[PDB]
Design an enzyme around this catalytic site. Structure first.
Site, PDB file in Angstrom:
ATOM      1  N   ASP A  62       0.817  -1.217   0.000  1.00 40.79           N
ATOM      2  CA  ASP A  62       0.000   0.000   0.000  1.00 40.79           C
ATOM      3  C   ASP A  62       0.851   1.268   0.000  1.00 40.79           C
ATOM      4  OD1 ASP A  62      -2.015  -1.899   0.203  1.00 40.79           O
ATOM      5  OD2 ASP A  62      -2.212  -1.643   2.375  1.00 40.79           O
ATOM      6  N   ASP A 115      -5.877 -10.325  -4.150  1.00 40.60           N
ATOM      7  CA  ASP A 115      -7.087  -9.532  -4.353  1.00 40.60           C
ATOM      8  C   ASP A 115      -8.229  -9.980  -3.448  1.00 40.60           C
ATOM      9  OD1 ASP A 115      -5.331  -9.036  -6.576  1.00 40.60           O
ATOM     10  OD2 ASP A 115      -7.040  -8.192  -7.669  1.00 40.60           O
ATOM     11  N   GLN A 117      -7.774 -11.597  -0.467  1.00 44.65           N
ATOM     12  CA  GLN A 117      -7.334 -11.268   0.887  1.00 44.65           C
ATOM     13  C   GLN A 117      -7.542  -9.793   1.219  1.00 44.65           C
ATOM     14  OE1 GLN A 117      -4.994 -12.539   4.152  1.00 44.65           O
ATOM     15  NE2 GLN A 117      -6.758 -11.150   4.098  1.00 44.65           N
ATOM     16  N   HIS A 508      71.032 -68.531  23.219  1.00 41.40           N
ATOM     17  CA  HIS A 508      70.486 -67.437  24.013  1.00 41.40           C
ATOM     18  C   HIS A 508      69.536 -67.928  25.098  1.00 41.40           C
ATOM     19  CE1 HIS A 508      71.500 -65.134  20.177  1.00 41.40           C
ATOM     20  NE2 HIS A 508      72.284 -64.621  21.107  1.00 41.40           N
ATOM     21  N   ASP A 549      70.025 -60.296  27.788  1.00 40.08           N
ATOM     22  CA  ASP A 549      69.419 -61.023  26.675  1.00 40.08           C
ATOM     23  C   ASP A 549      68.088 -61.642  27.080  1.00 40.08           C
ATOM     24  OD1 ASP A 549      71.310 -60.455  24.698  1.00 40.08           O
ATOM     25  OD2 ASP A 549      72.564 -62.184  25.196  1.00 40.08           O
ATOM     26  N   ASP A 669      79.972 -60.337  27.074  1.00 41.37           N
ATOM     27  CA  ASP A 669      79.097 -61.020  26.126  1.00 41.37           C
ATOM     28  C   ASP A 669      79.856 -62.098  25.354  1.00 41.37           C
ATOM     29  OD1 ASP A 669      76.521 -61.372  25.234  1.00 41.37           O
ATOM     30  OD2 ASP A 669      76.505 -59.577  23.974  1.00 41.37           O
TER      31      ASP A 669
END
Ligand SMILES: Nc1nc2c(ncn2[C@@H]2O[C@H](COP(=O)(O)O)[C@@H](O)[C@H]2O)c(=O)[nH]1
Ligand SMILES: Nc1nc2c(ncn2[C@@H]2O[C@H](COP(=O)(O)O)[C@@H](O)[C@H]2O)c(=O)[nH]1
Ligand SMILES: Nc1nc2c(ncn2[C@@H]2O[C@@H]3COP(=O)(O)O[C@H]3[C@H]2O)c(=O)[nH]1
Ligand SMILES: Nc1nc2c(ncn2[C@@H]2O[C@@H]3COP(=O)(O)O[C@H]3[C@H]2O)c(=O)[nH]1
Ligand SMILES: [Mg+2]
Ligand SMILES: [Mg+2]
Ligand SMILES: [Zn+2]
Ligand SMILES: [Zn+2]
Lengths: 771, 41, 771, 41
Positions: A62, A115, A117, A508, A549, A669
């Site tokens: 508007d 229109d 509404q 070992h 070891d 060793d």
């Protein structure tokens, strides 16, 4: 032109908002063009996009000259939304083209919903969408030209010239809003990454951290996340009622992977009033999030759902009123699923009404989808955290069960510490340490009859239990138990567990560890090298010599690297020496086995360092590297005129003592080479067998040709290679020790005799191949 | 009849052969051979 | 007319910025041309502001602008602009003050800069300044110089200049908003791609950073950039420290990171974006590497600043390459280097970004982008450290499990003690004997199943040695006739029986004796109880193996103790903790080929046996038993209605679930089968159980500081018979009554419970006589 | 001469159970008691 110029300057000044809202400047231009076109009720339809469907919504209605902006502005509570397939504004937004339609009741695209509404009659309207960068921002409306029909082409020309200003204002606002939303996205990602990488956590904690941290950059009045049960299969005993048919199979909501839709936890982030977090374990179906079907609908299907005016929908039973009595009502809803890497829905995030009150558009959809995607990617950290906890627990269980199996049973102790047979207690070790010392000192063989101090001592006549007894005797002879308060039961237990931790390998085995420990004892005492080491250091070296070891599998470091063994991937260098050190420390960890429990903290720190240096110094590559430094030490110690001067020179420097200790452990060793020919021949047979089975492992598992030392095919070449071992590695350790102290002179003598025998067999091989 | 809702997008981020460069990502002269002869190293 | 023409030319000015694909500098050039024409000034110009390193500067963009001039000649490139810091020049003072400065004679203000006046050879004698300030930021300072017709700019000239600068401010803020949107879009995409690539998998630093940087490549928009990763080793090995401590090698002197590590770029990753888009990686790059030849990456590694340098080869400190870097004519123009930072502030790497894709110097916005990238990489370092922890934990677990399994496995002597092949077959150590011959030689040596009551429910293990238990267990497997049917090796069977025996700890009741009695109960319920008629020979083989291994490694504690102590078992296995441990360990023991008693059956049979094992061992849990009592009762009640034994076999055999429930009940009745033994044997087993539960209660009171349940509590020792009566009245009576209904052959087991109950009552009521 | 002035890292921006809500983030009637008395559960 003068008033047209003044109006152009007014438009240029209102374009310079300097702050405020661009709708005000657009409204002032719209009322300008309204008074210019002899038309009323101009309008703007903003274009939104929700779910990827475009729509238009009336924003100023508007429009009248000399009208107040406040009455022209329509808020989203009264906005009229049209999809692009409804109304000529929808067709205009589709086509992006200028349309001028008179007698709209004859147009096939005119919609009279507005229109009806408003009760206003429209006859002729002009439409031109604002389009920038191919994107449509607003449809501008000029309607019901007064006193005239069909508008005019000059009306369209001035309309385009003012819509240039309108497009300027709208593009400035669009660039500002796209900057805002993209800054929000980037800050969300930065904060979520900062909170995800803070630590490893389960899903719940990590998602809670991330969402709580990013709460300020999502302009939602509230939102929540629901986590679904992730269990996929059931236990057989909970299938049994289903398979027997005693219970009807579950029917109802199911995720696409087929799991039951059970939200096991809900997290609510409420931000409208007081910011509060609610964690609801096992929420009921009456939960204000779940009471509407939308989270469950997302869990079944997995769509991103933007639904405006949600209580006006018919499918979802959204609450039409307050849910927490606080007066908050659901207006707009945006729900998204969080997924696994496998597309499996772990959770559903639902974002409620936007703080601005506008319906959610594609921008907030984009923000929330990038957050949800980052959360779905972040689950790698949760899965890794769970795998960490499972691996840790399995490791600790396996280590405890191993240590329990290896530890010597109380019968094995009582076999040696015969307290039961001599103190008549049989139930509790309540007897004092003096009593245990007194009863045990009979049971050990005397060190003189066992020749344990002598360099010649051969372990063939003794049994392995006699070797344990002799080991405790060696510890007794150093006089360690009284000084460091090593309990006798834990001493015997530790010796037996160390024995049992040596495998039954050909060389070992426990006999090699015992002969090395006896060499450490005899070098300390009879070699008189203990003059450089404290009794604490002597105790640490003797324990390290017995463990140097421990749990040797029977293979070389080259074998571990070539076989890619877990030892080789765990310990990058000195693989087996680091394994022996780790396992000896593991044995010393148990209070039951800690022969170092009665030490100071600094003494253990010292014992641990001596253990480390000694066992890693059992690596012969390290020996070869540090030979030159030991030789420099011996050369500097030879020119000293006084024995006490030499003692001072070595003792003042920790590194020289460490190098000499490494050299002692290498003399220990390889001591067998110095033993009499009978012993050397047997031990050389044992190492040759061990090397042969290593070469058979290399040829069979690793499928490679072994070195001639590892090869059985070169068996008769053994003595010549033995000669090569005698010159390259042992003479130096032993000649330099004989120079350092003459008391280790006979060990070189033993080597010298053994070398002659090794040369003799090589000459016997020279006879054999030449004929 | 539920409203039409947007499908999740995954193709853009779905996308290391594709990433280039991932394939790659002391003694005296005499001792070097005879240490390997006895497996000292 | 002047107003009309000015409004029209400012409208056209505004439209020039709407021309998509145009540049704002063109519109500002038109604005300056109009300004210079109106004001009767000459050589108008603008200086764009920049910020580098956090300090502001100005640079000219359009020089010598005059009405009717070419835009190309007036625009100066960023390679020809003159840069002024804010502390110098009137343009700097205007940018600082953010206000108008009108100076008529340049010699009267100390802010006059001679630099450009000598650079271009122009003389200046009039200056008016006003910065374009929007959003508290200065975008450009506009300059009017040398008014040709006057010696001063009057206040009306200031007002007209202010209005034209408001229009220039509109244009410049539009361009600024577009540029900031572009910057934030870049940053958002950078973070999203970096997160996608970091969470793609768990990997090392090098791989993860290469993925992230290579993906973000398109969004950095640099011509070239690289990353250098520093060595992260902090401490040295003692043997590499020895020469430093003794003094053979001088201490390292050179660049150091702030942590103190040597600056050693161990890897460089170059991303070349100027041409061919080549990526290279250089491990251990030399110091002559083109990135490191300039000191800047090393300077960042030493200090950790963000370095934006414009005209890097014009600087004298860093010695940048003045010429081409390589054979291609690329030269360094601008540079931006940033460090990547660990969680502990350690410098992990340095990222260096060279000149932009366009000629402009790096602004603060590129510094912002690059710092967010380097922060994201510094956070994904947490994923890399997690990956390294993952690999170490996995390796440590696998080593501990292998060493455990080697310790627990029976030695060849323990095999030979049962399978006396050597002393009977006259064979060597290597087994080359036929499987049938090994069967024939073993089958003599086991105790016959008819003596010692092996099939009978009366069996007492007290007069047997544990070696006789192993022999009897191999005998039990032998009568079921499994070895020839399933092709299990005899030596594998014997070794598996012996390792199952050593698996079971020496606890008072959950030792090997309980496992053997449960296996004997499984055998006798199969054969004498006739329940073998419900199961295949494979299923019976699984029943016996699970019956022996049901309690394996039971530590002597219950699941309550596991939960209460937060045991690693309880954190690994959620429910049925100990039975899940027994299952996992029995499966581990079956996993070795040397112990895989199921190695010679089909894959489908192995899956069946594994499900059998799972059902049996989890069904050893009595909570599951109590849950499924009612279902088993319904099975028995349905099975007794039928008046044909064949009908019962049909009814049970067709449903796997009924067979699984009867299997669970079979194993439950087997576990507690000692209550059905004769009174003496029951009394001794209940004493052993009560001793185990009392030591549990003493452990629980000692280490958890909690009160035991009355059944665990040693102070109510004499209350044992009443609670045993409770166990009689609640547990066993149901199982053995339902089994006696199911088959009358199990009736004596209930009857044995029936006598033992009387004996427990005859000693409980005597406690009522003691009180 | 001296090096150019360069910016320091903005560590202050992200320098940082405080997250609210993280603190929390089968038998018969007779069988509920006697089973616990035997430690069966
Ligand atoms: N050729 C040869 N090598 C030996 C002899 N004794 C020890 N070695 C080598 O020296 C190593 C010593 O380290 P250990 O295995 O004792 O920790 C052995 O593994 C083996 O490689 C020997 O008598 N002859
Ligand atoms: N009171 C009592 N409980 C028993 C007896 N035999 C077994 N149990 C219970 O049955 C459980 C069987 O578990 P498992 O032997 O598989 O570890 C035991 O842990 C114990 O709780 C018994 O003779 N008397
Ligand atoms: N009541 C009212 N309706 C308007 C105004 N401006 C445009 N419209 C109308 O709203 C309608 C929506 O659908 P159409 O595209 O068919 O046509 C549009 C018009 O007829 C206005 O200012 N007031
Ligand atoms: N050659 C040239 N000089 C200019 C122009 N605009 C401004 N200047 C001048 O260059 C100077 C740089 O430093 P100041 O801020 O002191 O003052 C400025 C002026 O006097 C121009 O368009 N061309
Ligand atoms: Mg070793
Ligand atoms: Mg059990
Ligand atoms: Zn050794
Ligand atoms: Zn049991």
């Amino acid at each position: 032109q003068v008033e047209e110029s003044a109006l152009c300057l007014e438009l240029l000044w209102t374009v310079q908002e300097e702050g405020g809202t661009p709708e005000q400047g657009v409204h002032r231009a719209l009322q300008r063009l309204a008074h210019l076109l002899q038309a009323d009720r101009c309008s703007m339809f903003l274009c939104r996009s929700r779910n990827g469907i475009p729509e238009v919504a009336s924003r100023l209605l508007d429009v009248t000259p000399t009208s107040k902006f406040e009455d022209n502005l329509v808020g989203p509570d009264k906005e009229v939304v049209f999809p692009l397939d409804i109304g000529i504004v929808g067709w205009a937004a589709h086509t992006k083209k200028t349309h001028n339609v008179p007698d709209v009741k004859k147009n096939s695209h005119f919609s009279d919903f507005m229109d009806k509404q408003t009760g206003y009659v429209t006859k002729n309207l002009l439409a031109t969408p604002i389009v920038v960068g191919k994107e449509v921002l607003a449809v501008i409306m000029a309607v019901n030209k007064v006193n005239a029909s069909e508008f005019s082409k000059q009306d369209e020309e001035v309309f385009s010239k003012y819509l240039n200003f309108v497009s300027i204002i709208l593009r400035l606002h669009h660039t500002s809003y796209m900057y805002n939303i993209e800054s929000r996205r980037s800050q969300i990602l930065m904060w979520s990454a900062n909170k995800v990488f803070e630590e490893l956590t389960d899903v719940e904690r990590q998602f809670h951290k991330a969402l709580y941290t990013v709460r300020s950059y999502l302009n939602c009045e509230r939102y929540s996340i629901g986590l679904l049960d992730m269990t996929k299969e059931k236990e057989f005993y909970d299938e049994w009622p289903i398979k027997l048919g005693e219970v009807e199979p579950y029917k109802g909501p199911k995720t696409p992977d087929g799991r039951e839709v059970n939200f096991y936890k809900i997290i609510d982030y409420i931000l409208h009033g007081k910011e509060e977090i609610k964690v609801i374990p096992t929420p009921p179906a009456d939960h204000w999030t779940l009471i509407s079907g939308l989270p469950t609908y997302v869990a079944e299907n997995g769509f991103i759902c933007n639904m405006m005016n949600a209580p006006a929908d018919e499918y979802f039973t959204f609450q039409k009123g307050p849910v927490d009595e606080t007066g908050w009502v659901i207006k707009n809803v945006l729900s998204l699923p969080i997924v696994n890497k496998k597309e499996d829905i772990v959770g559903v995030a639902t974002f409620y009404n936007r703080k601005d009150g506008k319906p959610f558009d594609e921008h907030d959809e984009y923000i929330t989808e990038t957050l949800t995607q980052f959360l779905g990617w972040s689950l790698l950290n949760t899965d890794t955290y769970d795998k960490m906890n499972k691996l840790e627990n399995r490791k600790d269980i396996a280590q405890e069960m191993l240590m329990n199996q290896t530890k010597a049973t109380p019968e094995e102790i009582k076999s040696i510490l015969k307290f039961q047979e001599k103190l008549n207690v049989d139930v509790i070790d309540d007897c004092e340490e003096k009593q245990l010392v007194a009863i045990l000192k009979e049971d050990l063989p005397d060190p003189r009859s066992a020749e344990l101090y002598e360099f010649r001592f051969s372990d063939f006549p003794l049994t392995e239990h006699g070797l344990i007894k002799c080991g405790i005797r060696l510890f007794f002879e150093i006089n360690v138990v009284e000084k460091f308060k090593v309990p006798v039961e834990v001493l015997t237990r530790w010796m037996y567990t160390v024995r049992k931790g040596y495998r039954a390998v050909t060389y070992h085995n426990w006999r090699h560890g015992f002969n090395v420990g006896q060499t450490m004892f005899t070098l300390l005492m009879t070699g008189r090298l203990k003059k450089y080491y404290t009794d604490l250091e002597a105790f640490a070296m003797l324990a390290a010599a017995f463990c140097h070891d421990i749990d040797h599998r029977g293979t070389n470091n080259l074998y571990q690297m070539k076989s890619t063994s877990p030892l080789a991937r765990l310990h990058g260098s000195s693989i087996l020496e680091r394994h022996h050190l780790e396992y000896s420390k593991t044995l010393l960890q148990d209070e039951s086995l800690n022969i170092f429990q009665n030490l100071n903290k600094r003494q253990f720190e010292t014992v641990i360092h001596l253990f480390e240096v000694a066992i890693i110094a059992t690596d012969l590559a390290l020996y070869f590297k540090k030979r030159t430094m030991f030789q420099k030490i011996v050369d500097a110690c030879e020119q000293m005129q006084t024995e006490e001067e030499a003692i001072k020179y070595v003792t003042v420097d920790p590194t020289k003592k460490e190098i000499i200790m490494a050299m002692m452990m290498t003399a220990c060793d390889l001591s067998a080479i110095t033993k009499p020919w009978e012993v050397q021949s047997q031990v050389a047979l044992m190492v040759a067998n061990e090397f042969w089975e290593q070469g058979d492992l290399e040829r069979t598992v690793l499928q490679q040709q072994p070195i001639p030392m590892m090869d059985r095919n070169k068996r008769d070449e053994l003595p010549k290679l033995q000669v090569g071992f005698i010159d390259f590695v042992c003479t130096f350790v032993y000649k330099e020790f004989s120079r350092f102290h003459k008391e280790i002179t006979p060990m070189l003598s033993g080597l010298q005799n053994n070398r002659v025998e090794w040369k003799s067999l090589a000459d016997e091989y020279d006879a054999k191949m030449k004929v | 009849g539920p409203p039409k809702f947007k499908q999740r997008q995954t193709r853009q981020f779905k996308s290391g052969d594709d990433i280039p460069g991932m394939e790659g990502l002391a003694f005296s002269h005499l001792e070097l051979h005879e240490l390997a002869q006895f497996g000292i190293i």
